Amino acid sequence: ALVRRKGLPGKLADCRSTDPRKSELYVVEGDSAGGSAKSGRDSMFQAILPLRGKIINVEKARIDRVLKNTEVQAIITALGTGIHDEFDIGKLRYHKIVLMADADVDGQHISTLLLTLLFRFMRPLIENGHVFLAQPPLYKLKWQRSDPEFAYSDRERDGLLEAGLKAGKKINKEDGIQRYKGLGEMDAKELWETTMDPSVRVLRQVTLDDAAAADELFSILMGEDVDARRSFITRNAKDVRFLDV
Amino acid sequence: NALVRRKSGLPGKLADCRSTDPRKSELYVVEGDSAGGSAKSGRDSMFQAILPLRGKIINVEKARIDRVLKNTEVQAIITALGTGIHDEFDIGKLRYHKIVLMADADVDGQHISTLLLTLLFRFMRPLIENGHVFLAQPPLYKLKWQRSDPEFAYSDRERDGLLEAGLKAGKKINKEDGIQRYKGLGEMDAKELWETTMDPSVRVLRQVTLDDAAAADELFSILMGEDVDARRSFITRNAKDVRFLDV
Amino acid sequence: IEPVDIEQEMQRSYIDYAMSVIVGRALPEVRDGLKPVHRRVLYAMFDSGFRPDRSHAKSARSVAETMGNYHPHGDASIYDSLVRMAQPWSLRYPLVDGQGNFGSPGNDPPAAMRYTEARLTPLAMEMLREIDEETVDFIPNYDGRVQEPTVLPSRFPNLLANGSGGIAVGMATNIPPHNLRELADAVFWALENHDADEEETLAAVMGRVKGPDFPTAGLIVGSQGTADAYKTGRGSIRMRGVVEVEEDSRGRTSLVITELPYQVNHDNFITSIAEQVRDGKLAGISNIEDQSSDRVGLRIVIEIKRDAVAKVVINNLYKHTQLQTSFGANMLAIVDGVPRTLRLDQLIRYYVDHQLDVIVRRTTYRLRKANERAHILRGLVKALDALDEVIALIRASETVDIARAGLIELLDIDEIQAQAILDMQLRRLAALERQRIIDDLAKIEAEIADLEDILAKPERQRGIVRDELAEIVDRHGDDRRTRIIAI
Amino acid sequence: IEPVDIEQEMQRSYIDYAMSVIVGRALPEVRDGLKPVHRRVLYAMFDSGFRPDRSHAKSARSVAETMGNYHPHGDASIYDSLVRMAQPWSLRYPLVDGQGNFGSPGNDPPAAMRYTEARLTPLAMEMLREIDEETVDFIPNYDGRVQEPTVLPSRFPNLLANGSGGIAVGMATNIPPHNLRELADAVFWALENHDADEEETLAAVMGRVKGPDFPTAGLIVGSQGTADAYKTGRGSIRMRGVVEVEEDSRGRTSLVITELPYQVNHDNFITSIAEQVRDGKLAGISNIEDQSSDRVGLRIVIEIKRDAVAKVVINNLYKHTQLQTSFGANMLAIVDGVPRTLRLDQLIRYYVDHQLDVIVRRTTYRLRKANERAHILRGLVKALDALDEVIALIRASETVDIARAGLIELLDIDEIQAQAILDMQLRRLAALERQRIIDDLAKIEAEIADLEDILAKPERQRGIVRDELAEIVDRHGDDRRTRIIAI
DNA sequence: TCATGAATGACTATGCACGT
DNA sequence: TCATGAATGACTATGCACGT
Ligand SMILES: COc1c(N2C[C@@H]3CCCN[C@@H]3C2)c(F)cc2c(=O)c(C(=O)O)cn(C3CC3)c12
Ligand SMILES: COc1c(N2C[C@@H]3CCCN[C@@H]3C2)c(F)cc2c(=O)c(C(=O)O)cn(C3CC3)c12
Ligand SMILES: [Mg+2]
Ligand SMILES: [Mg+2]
Ligand SMILES: [Mg+2]
Ligand SMILES: [Mg+2]
Structure with a gap:
């Protein structure tokens, strides 16, 4: 068991449960999203740490400079574990670390930066499956009479729309289908019912198979060597769609 | 008498002049960062310095002295003028013999003027008595004639007058672009500020005079003091006749 | 110089x-209970079409x-x-429908601006109802x-409603919010008893407006402060949150606060209690958990x-925190460009006066337009009766000006009417x-006569205010939130 | 999970x-030289009507x-x-007409946003010219x-012009700005020699585009880097400010810098000189005054x-400050959704291609609309030729549809034409x-003939681009600012 | 290490009146 | 001394590539 604040980051909205095993940390993109998330969370088991701005690239940046970065300090301090050789999973204050960023490309970029931080400073958190990725909704179908539905893809939107219309439900062609361009546009309720309610949230657990293969990929994508990254993109971007086929 | 100007122990916001002679130097105390930025660009850097003030100035009549001295904007003014305050006031160390207060023509600019004049009258009264304090009158309108040079107006009346004269003279204005209305110094660029408030050959300055010190003291204490009741009754008593002060 | x-x-x-x-x-x-920024925002949204439709x-x-x-x-x-204007804990009747994160009653x-969307609420649409009819x-x-x-037209008493x-x-100024239904009853009485003096009117209105109705619910303790505010224009209204004592399986007891008085920051309230225990001043409290x-x-x-x-600690909370706090009522509003402290009957009356002005002006505008339509229609009707000549006239005209000048002479018609032909x-x-033009003329003249009748009869004018307001209250009126108890 | x-x-x-x-x-x-945000701002202002008029x-x-x-x-x-986009020291050809304080080349x-106003510039109006004609x-x-x-249609080569x-x-990417008149000459050559291969085109275009033309004036020293940029897509262009030696009355000499190279902050430049004297690295300097x-x-x-x-001190300034500084040209632009490094002949060609596409598409749209208008006008003339009959028919109809269906029967008409009647x-x-309708038909058929002629002849299409662009350059073209000197 | 330029906003201080 | 709310924005840190 570990004490919750009521010596930790000022931005941290800690949970109430003293048990790390039951506790969860939602690392959120933006003050707005983190603010509403703080309101829609389950304050018992879920803590919120909003991260502001692009995270510093630990692959590129010198070590001391990373340690000066306020956002990195917030993460390291909040997780309780150390870093590198001084890492101790026994001090892990949340056994569930959910990264929640916008569905857009900048959210994807922030994810890669956070995953780089974790893989380089606190790898065991990934190896032991304590790192997760929340999948935000993209659309909200607001039926005239029926309860609203959330869609996490264009396909799902098309499907739910088809099913509803076939079932006799109807939507306004003005209000209609609300499209989310980021977590910041969501209120507390919407976040709870899509990304934080454990009974409906869509989490993806980050797994680490080949550490050496992961190591070189991180070094390529996040490293200082531009040439290597440039050729990698031109080589593999052509086939990004077909990774899961 | 001469004093060094800052060039790469004075306020960071101060854009000092080059001339080391206070008798020839001027300090423009400007309302807002935008206006201060334009003033810094349109000024004559030889004789004119810019000290932008951000936000409403602290009321030195209401606030206790220790809190006033901790106010960053007051510190900037006191430091920029070089003179001390109250008993430690030494006019010989005055860094500018012209202190131009330049605020928006709007209502909040007038308010800032009274707060600045309150600071001066309470902390550095001799600056007022010796005619070192001035008020800049910003333009309200800019008449953009199609073929002639543009004209500035400092009142609605002057706008009407210049409009009539120009039209009578055969000039023409676009009824779209036409007469630009200034709602504040921040809306002006460097050139516009120079040609209306900073060019000493065109600017309209008002020199603050102090006749009856005892009467001034009373008025200052009433309008700016902690006593609300006195201020309320004064406003309801005299607001009715503000138009007729100069008739 | x-x-x-x-x-x-x-x-x-x-x-x-x-x-x-x-x-x-x-x-x-006093008429719409709005400051310039509020009015300008709402009209800006209105004119931009940012409406609930x-x-x-x-x-x-x-x-x-x-x-x-x-x-x-x-x-x-x-x-x-x-x-x-979009926060339900700020305005008793929100005027802005906000989408996104608009904060909380706490320090969140x-x-x-970039993250939020907004449009007018239905009630705000009643603030602006028929604003385009002069x-x-x-x-x-x-x-x-x-x-x-x-x-604004303000077709519901927004000053008193939203405060x-x-x-x-x-x-x-510090005017509290009120329940719309109670205000409506006061307005309904003011309309029926349009000749009642201030003394009687104040008695009637005070009976119907039982007291302020805060969006944050809570409690109003006592009646004197409310009475003072309505009779004097100034009064101190004691507010309380709601506390519900819970027992534990162990037998331990805990106080559950589910409401706080108007304009009490939730996080400041918790922080206050916390600071008022970490160093004593609120003994008996074991633990504080949100x-x-x-x-x-x-x-x-x-x-x-x-x-x-339990009650000892509750009474201590009432004493040393904002769980119990007073609303410093000061009924100050601008009346005809002058600031004035107003009795409740004056606030109601001045609003009713505004409504009557709105309805008369609307009727005047509609009557003027109705005549213009009727005027042109009469012109068309004349053209139809001599349609064979009218068309022959236009065709034989070298220009349209010649045709227009001819039409005027042909049918003895205005230039505006001839222009319509x-x-x-x-x-x-x-x-x-051809038939609908005839019927439309018959339709309008009935409308003109009706409008003239409205302007000629103050009774109908008051009736319109009543009926139109009643419609609004039936649709947008809600239950009382703040409960009123005695000492 | x-x-x-x-x-x-x-x-x-x-x-x-x-x-x-x-x-x-x-x-x-590559076609309009715009990034997404630029294009969206400009079109937002355009659609909003924030235009020079x-x-x-x-x-x-x-x-x-x-x-x-x-x-x-x-x-x-x-x-x-x-x-x-409104700063004359940032854009060689500003696309935004800014009113108010938009900063300076220094740290001002x-x-x-609250203090400034803005509208599109005339040249920006050429970026958007006939965007509403498909x-x-x-x-x-x-x-x-x-x-x-x-x-955007981009009726002047904006990528090369503004960089x-x-x-x-x-x-x-790092594309420098160029002189519009010089770009136009290259475009004119590309149009005339439309079949010329890349080698000839690169030679011809390089002869006419003498080098970058920066909004900040200054100097370009040498020719190698410019050639490399145009031939390779990568090149290092040496820039210099302008220095003028002045001899004082008392006898001292001073360096007067009146211009600086592109994207050199004035305040940083002064600070750099100052600080390299504070430490002591630019001896010979006595005093710095702005x-x-x-x-x-x-x-x-x-x-x-x-x-x-003086020459020694100037050379020291060239070495140790940005009085002399290089522009690292990297001619990278998106082509058909693909990033590509382009020679100067490729950049010109791709732009000319885009212009021809614009003109052909415009002609098609105008031809379609012209046909529609003519189609209706053909209906109108038929009505006029049988005018007496048209009216009598419409009269006897219970609806307008019976009148319509009859008009089709009477004059053999479409539904569109009859509806237009x-x-x-x-x-x-x-x-x-009536005569205006006749002449209007004659006018459109003449315009249709012209439009058809354009589509059938690439020669005219190239002529249109040339002449229209020529009009733009004559009106909005200016003198060269950056002077080109040898080693 | 700094500049470039589109991307990912909270904090900071006064006026003003009034009540605990 | 703190809250209210309608008035009077610059500063702060990162990603990213490239050349000093
Ligand atoms: C620079 O002034 C402001 C300050 N500062 C003023 C002080 C003196 C200088 C050093 N900083 C302090 C804080 C502040 F804290 C907040 C705001 C503010 O919110 C605001 C607005 O439009 O909402 C507008 N302004 C500006 C119109 C003046 C604010
Ligand atoms: C809080 O993020 C920002 C910072 N901070 C991020 C850092 C971490 C925390 C402590 N502050 C530093 C500075 C900053 F300095 C500037 C901007 C900024 O200009 C901006 C914009 O729209 O232009 C948007 N944002 C936000 C959308 C992220 C900025
Ligand atoms: Mg986003
Ligand atoms: Mg102003
Ligand atoms: Mg920014
Ligand atoms: Mg603010």
Whole structure:
């Protein structure tokens, strides 16, 4: 068991449960999203740490400079574990670390930066499956009479729309289908019912198979060597769609 | 008498002049960062310095002295003028013999003027008595004639007058672009500020005079003091006749 | 260089500041209960079409439209004003439908302008109802490019409903919010008893407006302060939150706070109690835990010691925290460009007067337009009766000016009417199409007579205010939230 | 809960980011030389009517419109992008007419959004010329509410004219600005010699485009780097400011710097000289004085010691300050959704290709519309030829449909034409108006003939681009600013 | 290490009146 | 001394590539 604040980051909205095993940390993109998330969370088991701005690239940046970065300090301090050789999973204050960023490309970029931080400073958190990725909704179908539905893809939107219309439900062609361009546009309720309610949230657990293969990929994508990254993109971007086929 | 100007122990916001002679130097105390930025660009850097003030100035009549001295904007003014305050006031160390207060023509600019004049009258009264304090009158309108040079107006009346004269003279204005209305110094660029408030050959300055010190003291204490009741009754008593002060 | 005396300058400048702040910024117009920024935002959204019949527009567009046309000030503070009007814990009857993160009753700030969308609420649509029918005076904006409303129609008593708080110069206002249904009853009585004097009117209205109705629910303790506010224009109203004592399986007891009085910051309240225990001043309290959520609402659990009495700790909380706090009522509003402290009957009466003015002006506008339509229709009817000649006349004319001048002479018609004949489509010459012109004339003349009757009868005017308001209250009226108890 | 491998997640996410930054953000489209935010701001202002034929709109309105309809990002950085397009020291050919404080080449920041107004410049109006005539492909915006353009018509070669600098992922662009008149000559040659191969075209275009023309004037030293940039797509161009030695009365000599190379901050430059003397690295310098003003422009006076040679001090300034600095040209632009490094002949050609596409598409649209108008006019003439019969028919119809169906029967008409006859006003039955309809048909058939001729002849199409562009250059073209000298 | 330029806003201080 | 709310925005840190 570990004490919750009521010596930790000022931005941290800690949970109430003293048990790390039951506790969860939602690392959120933006003050707005983190603010509403703080309101829609389950304050018992879920803590919120909003991260502001692009995270510093630990692959590129010198070590001391990373340690000066306020956002990195917030993460390291909040997780309780150390870093590198001084890492101790026994001090892990949340056994569930959910990264929640916008569905857009900048959210994807922030994810890669956070995953780089974790893989380089606190790898065991990934190896032991304590790192997760929340999948935000993209659309909200607001039926005239029926309860609203959330869609996490264009396909799902098309499907739910088809099913509803076939079932006799109807939507306004003005209000209609609300499209989310980021977590910041969501209120507390919407976040709870899509990304934080454990009974409906869509989490993806980050797994680490080949550490050496992961190591070189991180070094390529996040490293200082531009040439290597440039050729990698031109080589593999052509086939990004077909990774899961 | 001469004093060094800052060039790469004075306020960071101060854009000092080059001339080391206070008798020839001027300090423009400007309302807002935008206006201060334009003033810094349109000024004559030889004789004119810019000290932008951000936000409403602290009321030195209401606030206790220790809190006033901790106010960053007051510190900037006191430091920029070089003179001390109250008993430690030494006019010989005055860094500018012209202190131009330049605020928006709007209502909040007038308010800032009274707060600045309150600071001066309470902390550095001799600056007022010796005619070192001035008020800049910003333009309200800019008449953009199609073929002639543009004209500035400092009142609605002057706008009407210049409009009539120009039209009578055969000039023409676009009824779209036409007469630009200034709602504040921040809306002006460097050139516009120079040609209306900073060019000493065109600017309209008002020199603050102090006749009856005892009467001034009373008025200052009433309008700016902690006593609300006195201020309320004064406003309801005299607001009715503000138009007729100069008739 | 012109000389100016410091006294003249100081007096002139400060009075000019004081006056515009009083009448133009900080204090609400008695008729619609709005300050200039509120009015300008709402009309900006209205004119932009940001209405509940369309999807929420990005709130930046509302701010930008307000800035560029009506409110010559900063975008930031304008957004704050717009946000406040969307917060259900701020306004008893929100005027802005906000989409996104608009903050909380605690220290959680609203999201930035970029993240939020906004549109007018249905009730705000009643604030602006028929504003385009010359129901209120318009004046040129800050640069004369466009017109802005001096006041909104305000088809429900918004000042009393939503209240108002404002710091001016030499004075301040603090009007509490009220229940719409109760205000409506007061207005209904004021309309029926249109001749009743102030003494009787105050007695009637005070009986119907039982007291303020805060959006944060809670409790009103006592009746004197409420009475003072309505009879004097100033009064101190004691507010309380609600506390519900819970027992534990162990037998331990805890106080559950689910409501707080109006304008009490939830996080400051918890922090206050926390600071008022960490160093004593609230013994008997064992633990403070905020079990609040978006689903259960406010829920502050105060576990107390075994050797502690529930009511003793509750009474201590009432004493040393804002769990019990008073609303400093000060009924100050602008009346005809003058700040005035008002009795409740005066607040009701001045609003009823405004409604009557709105309805008469609307009727006047509609009557004028009805006549213009009738005038042109009469012109068309004349053309149809001599259609063979009219067409032959137009055809044989070398120009349209010749045709128009001829039509005037042919049918003994105005130039406006003759212009309408010329603008007539060949469509309108079909048999059934000729008939509708006739019928439309018959239709309008009935409408004209009706409108004339309304203007001639004050009874109907009052009846319209009543019926139209009743419709609004039936649709948008809600239950009382703040409970009123005795000492 | 679904499992995902870290390599899969990393690769997909970062590539998706890199590709959007490359193609959607940082790098200019070769056809109009615009990044997405630029294009969206400009079209937002355009659609909003913020054009030179109207007074400057508050810049907040441009930001809000861009943000709300096209650019799903923050107001701040959007304002920055709009501001930059209004700065004469940033853009060789400003696309935004800014009113107010938009900053300086030094550290003086632009005024906040609230203080500034903005509208499109005349040249920016050439960027958008006839965009509403289906000259460019439109796509749905970020929420599908409205349509936005994929590219602007760009009736002057804006990529080369204004240049572009952008940091993407894995690559970056740095195209310098050029003189419009010189670009036009290259375009004219490309049009005349439309079949010339790349070698000849590169030789011809390099002869006419003498080198970059920076808004900040200054000097270009040497020719190698310019040639490399045009031949390779990569090149290092040495820039210099302008120094003028002055001899003082008392006897001292001073260096007067009146120009600086592109993208050199004036205040940083002065600070750099100062600080390299504070430490002591530019001996011979006695005093540094910034005599700059809004009226004389840049004027930095560097008084040098008496035992110092002016040329030596200037060379020391060239070495140790940005008085001499290189422009790292990297001619990278998006071509057909693909990032590509381009020779100068390729950049010209691709632009000419885009212009021809625009003109052909415009002609097609005008021809379609012209045919429609003629189609209806053909109907109108038939009505006029049998005018007596037309009216009698419409009269006897119970509806307008019976009248319509009859009109088809009478004159063998479409439904469109008959409907157009139906919508006709009696105004047009006057003599001159009837003749106006006749002449209008004759006019359109003449225009149709002209339009058909254009589509059938590439020669005319190239002629249109040449002549229209020539008109633009004559009106909006200016003198060269950056002087080109040899080693 | 700094500049470039589109991307990812909270904090900071006064006026003004009034009540605990 | 703290809250209210309508008035009077610059500063702060990162990603990203490239050349000093
Ligand atoms: C620079 O002034 C402001 C300050 N500062 C003023 C002080 C003196 C200088 C050093 N900083 C302090 C804080 C502040 F804290 C907040 C705001 C503010 O919110 C605001 C708005 O439009 O909402 C507008 N302004 C500006 C119109 C003046 C604010
Ligand atoms: C809070 O993020 C920002 C910072 N901070 C991020 C850092 C970490 C925390 C402590 N502050 C530093 C500085 C900053 F300095 C500037 C901007 C900024 O200009 C901006 C914009 O729209 O233009 C948007 N944002 C936000 C959308 C992220 C900025
Ligand atoms: Mg986003
Ligand atoms: Mg102002
Ligand atoms: Mg603010
Ligand atoms: Mg920014």
